[PDB]
């Protein structure tokens, strides 16, 4: 599924991401935009052999099991395939664990490079929330 901007903002809010660990909804929306272009099916192979999955490009090195990331963990206790669903629950639950891990949203390199410090509220402008 390719979410609309305001549609994703509503789903993220519903699932408890808005101000989670102090990160406003705009931050999450912005991260999703640059991680996946709002596409739940997005996958991207990394140089180290791990793969990033779903709307928030959650990585198989630590967070999910894909069966082809040697030495990796599965700290969210999910198959990485679950992170590709049209329903964002698994991605949101796992994101919450990630953002609690110590470095906040800096875990998402596209958030640090493209969202951090910017006017992230723009991402939820006009949305009925």
Summarize the model shown.
It is built from four helices and three strands, in the order ααβββαα.
Task: Describe what this molecule looks like in 3D.
It is a single chain. This protein has 129 residues and is mainly α. The chain has a single domain, classed as Orthogonal Bundle (Lysozyme), CATH 1.10.530. The protein is 30% helix and 6% strand. It has helices spanning 5-14, 25-36, 89-99, 109-114; strands at 43-45, 51-53, 58-59. It has a three-stranded antiparallel β-sheet with strand order 1-2-3. The radius of gyration is 14 Å and the shape is globular. The two termini are 21 Å apart. The relative contact order is 0.21.
Observed structural traits:
mainly alpha; Lysozyme; 3-stranded antiparallel sheet; 6% strand; hydrolase; hen egg white lysozyme (HEWL); platinum; N-acetylglucosamine
The first-to-last residue Cα distance is 21 Å
The percent range for strand residues is 5-15%
* CATH top level label: Mainly Alpha
Q: Any idea how many domains? A: 1
State the CATH topology: Lysozyme
Number of helices: 4
Please provide the ordered H/E string of secondary-structure elements. Answer: HHEEEHH
Query: Rg to the nearest angstrom?
Result: 14 Å
Secondary structure category: mainly alpha
Q: How many β strands by DSSP? A: 3
Q: What's the architecture in CATH terms?
A: Orthogonal Bundle
Shape: globular
The biggest beta sheet is recorded as:
3 strands, antiparallel
The proportion of residues forming helix, as a percent range, comes to 25-40%
| Strand order within the widest beta sheet | 1-2-3
EC number: 3.2.1.17
Protein name: Lysozyme C
Keywords: Allergen, Antimicrobial, Bacteriolytic enzyme, Disulfide bond, Glycosidase, Hydrolase, Secreted, Signal
Domain C-type lysozyme: 1-129
């Amino acid at each position: 599924k390719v979410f609309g901007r305001c549609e994703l903002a509503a789903a993220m809010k519903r699932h408890g991401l808005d101000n989670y660990r102090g990160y406003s909804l705009g931050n999450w929306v912005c991260a999703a935009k640059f991680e996946s272009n709002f596409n739940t099916q997005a996958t991207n192979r990394n140089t180290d052999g791990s793969t990033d999955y779903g709307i928030l490009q959650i990585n198989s090195r630590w967070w999910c099991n894909d069966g082809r990331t040697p030495g990796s963990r599965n700290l969210c206790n999910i198959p990485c395939s679950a992170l590709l669903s049209s329903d964002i629950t698994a991605s949101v639950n796992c994101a919450k664990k990630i953002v609690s891990d110590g470095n906040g949203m800096n875990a998402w390199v596209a958030w640090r490079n493209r969202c951090k410090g910017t006017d992230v509220q723009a991402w939820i402008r006009g949305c009925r929330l």
